[PDB]
Amino acid sequence: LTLWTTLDPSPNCKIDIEKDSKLTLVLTKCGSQILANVSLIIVNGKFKILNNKTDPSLPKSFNIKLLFDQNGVLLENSNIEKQYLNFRSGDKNAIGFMPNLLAYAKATTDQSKIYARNTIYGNIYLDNQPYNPVVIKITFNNEADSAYSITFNYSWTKDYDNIPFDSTSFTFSYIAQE
Amino acid sequence: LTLWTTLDPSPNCKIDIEKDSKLTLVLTKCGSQILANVSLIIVNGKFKILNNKTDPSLPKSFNIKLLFDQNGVLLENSNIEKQYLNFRSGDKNAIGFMPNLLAYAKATTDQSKIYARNTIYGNIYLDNQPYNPVVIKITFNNEADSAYSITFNYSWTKDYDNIPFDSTSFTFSYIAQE
Amino acid sequence: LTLWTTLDPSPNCKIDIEKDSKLTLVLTKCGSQILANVSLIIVNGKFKILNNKTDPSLPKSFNIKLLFDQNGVLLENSNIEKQYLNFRSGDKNAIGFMPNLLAYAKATTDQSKIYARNTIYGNIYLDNQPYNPVVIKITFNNEADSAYSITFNYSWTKDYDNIPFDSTSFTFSYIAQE
């Protein structure tokens, strides 16, 4: 069972401006675990070409938030509209793809933090060069006004000088709600 | 088919003192490969808060050893008792979850080493901060007085100063015995 | 469904000289995604022991190329002969294991580059030591005179001084053609 984006380069995401990016995301249910594959191409807007070195007002991090309602359907405040995730031809209800509430509990309180296990860290690379690292930080179930969430935080420390945000691929897994 | 711990924060592991830690471990059989998801929270004992900077006697590494008998059931000398791994509701014999003996051969001799392929390295992070790295080193079939083993070695180089051992999640895979 | 090498240490690969290496590669079909496990042992030839420090003519990178024909069968110019990948006993046509053409498009032109999403980066370690890093760079569908390809580029920056090329294991996933 697969929940996925399209695989073409057609944008499906708003980081800065409408349709400025393509998040390619493939979620494969393997029983209790979701096997996840993600990449990002930024096609337009201020993050298409990282110009941190000549624009000190440009941020060195952003989020792509997948905020799910209790049915496992994306909410309006997500970076991607709900039409852009679909099931692959057979061989709504996407609760089976949602991050497990017991493994990845919400913050209990307003003064409370999630456990670190709700997060995965990985290194990905811009423009297919190992000297352009970006930290991809993936956090489950840590967003206000949502039933479930997957948040992709992208951050970097180098003052990049006209580097296209064309990211390498990253694989990870998380424990499924059901 | 899944072999797993509970997903709650309840401790199941002894690193230093009884029940000082929760190793959350999810093993999903995907035919010839086990898809594995692991995190660690240390709740009590000397490693709950890393105080290397003010306690030079505190180690900068420890092991969590899963020593299996030839039936794929944990042995007494493991860091976790055999009750703490169970099969997930259907849709002992856990030999299907054991690390493959041909791919991950035991040391032949007393002067002999395993092949490096018996090991995976990953970086995880304490307290959900990228400046708190720990090396997670996972080795198959390298333990005395066991049929199979999975060893999780955690090590670090920074003299951490009151950092909670609350680890981010890590995904890996290994080749199954059958 | 699994497409795999043998798991023993028997060489199956030519980097420098005939049969100088064993690439252990396990490809598990999980619906739309291939779960991949890879390791490399170099048994003979100039890369068996990295002597960069005392042989400045020795390269600090090499490729293992799996060039597939449109049937998903290895081509002669690959580093491995087509006999060395087989299906695991049931429970040619390997197009189901091929990297997806829409997700991992070929270079359009002669002046054109692939998208970065065609590549995965990982760090592996020689002789099971964390101070012997090698960058493993895996690229899909980027080779001339092939229908599909998986290229494993191994590179390093340290002038290694008699370090055996006995690599740790690495897991990754990619999107399947069908």
Side-chain angles (χ1 to χ4, degrees), chain B residues 42 45-62 126 131-134 154-165:
Chain B
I42 305 180
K46 63 194 184 186
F47 293 118
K48 176 192 186 204
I49 296 177
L50 298 190
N51 69 148
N52 294 112
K53 179 174 206 306
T54 59
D55 185 356
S57 83
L58 186 71
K60 290 168 80 164
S61 74
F62 60 84
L126 303 185
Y131 50 75
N132 305 320
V134 165
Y154 296 85
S155 66
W156 57 91
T157 57
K158 195 155 158 212
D159 281 330
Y160 286 128
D161 186 18
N162 300 338
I163 304 316
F165 209 113

Side-chain angles (χ1 to χ4, degrees), chain B residues 21-42:
Chain B
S21 50
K22 174 47 163 289
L23 182 76
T24 306
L25 180 65
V26 180
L27 306 179
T28 299
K29 198 175 172 58
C30 313
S32 56
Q33 278 187 72
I34 303 310
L35 179 56
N37 184 283
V38 63
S39 69
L40 179 64
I41 308 175
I42 305 180

Side-chain angles (χ1 to χ4, degrees), chain A residues 39-124:
Chain A
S39 69
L40 179 64
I41 308 175
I42 305 180
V43 171
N44 208 318
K46 63 194 184 186
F47 293 118
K48 176 192 186 204
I49 296 177
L50 298 190
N51 69 148
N52 294 112
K53 179 174 206 306
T54 59
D55 185 356
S57 83
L58 186 71
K60 290 168 80 164
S61 74
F62 60 84
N63 294 303
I64 296 173
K65 298 184 171 191
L66 282 64
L67 312 181
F68 297 97
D69 73 21
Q70 205 76 68
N71 312 317
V73 177
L74 286 170
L75 285 164
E76 267 154 314
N77 278 349
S78 310
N79 288 76
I80 299 180
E81 300 175 26
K82 62 180 172 182
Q83 63 175 297
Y84 291 112
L85 292 170
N86 293 275
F87 294 110
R88 180 211 211 206
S89 176
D91 304 82
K92 298 195 138 54
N93 183 315
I95 299 178
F97 288 85
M98 294 298 100
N100 188 282
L101 283 176
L102 182 60
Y104 313 128
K106 267 73 171 290
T108 56
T109 252
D110 236 350
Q111 280 81 295
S112 229
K113 38 180 330 161
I114 48 164
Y115 282 111
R117 65 184 184 166
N118 288 45
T119 296
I120 307 158
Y121 288 84
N123 285 312
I124 63 178

Side-chain angles (χ1 to χ4, degrees), chain B residues 122-166:
Chain B
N123 285 312
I124 63 178
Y125 299 87
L126 303 185
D127 202 21
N128 203 192
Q129 298 296 358
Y131 50 75
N132 305 320
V134 165
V135 175
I136 189 173
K137 176 177 70 168
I138 307 166
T139 300
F140 306 109
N141 293 343
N142 191 214
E143 297 293 343
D145 288 328
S146 65
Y148 305 100
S149 51
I150 308 170
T151 299
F152 300 91
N153 177 264
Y154 296 85
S155 66
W156 57 91
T157 57
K158 195 155 158 212
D159 281 330
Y160 286 128
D161 186 18
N162 300 338
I163 304 316
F165 209 113
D166 179 14

Side-chain angles (χ1 to χ4, degrees), chain A residues 2 4 7-9 22 24 26-28 30 35-37 39 41 88 125 127-130 166-169 171, chain C residues 30-33 35 100 102-104 113-121 123 137 139 172-175 178:
Chain A
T2 283
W4 65 356
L7 305 176
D8 79 338
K22 174 47 163 289
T24 306
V26 180
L27 306 179
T28 299
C30 313
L35 179 56
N37 184 283
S39 69
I41 308 175
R88 180 211 211 206
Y125 299 87
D127 202 21
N128 203 192
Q129 298 296 358
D166 179 14
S167 99
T168 61
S169 287
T171 291
Chain C
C30 313
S32 56
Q33 278 187 72
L35 179 56
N100 188 282
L102 182 60
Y104 313 128
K113 38 180 330 161
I114 48 164
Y115 282 111
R117 65 184 184 166
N118 288 45
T119 296
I120 307 158
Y121 288 84
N123 285 312
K137 176 177 70 168
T139 300
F172 63 98
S173 78
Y174 62 94
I175 309 156
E178 65 174 34

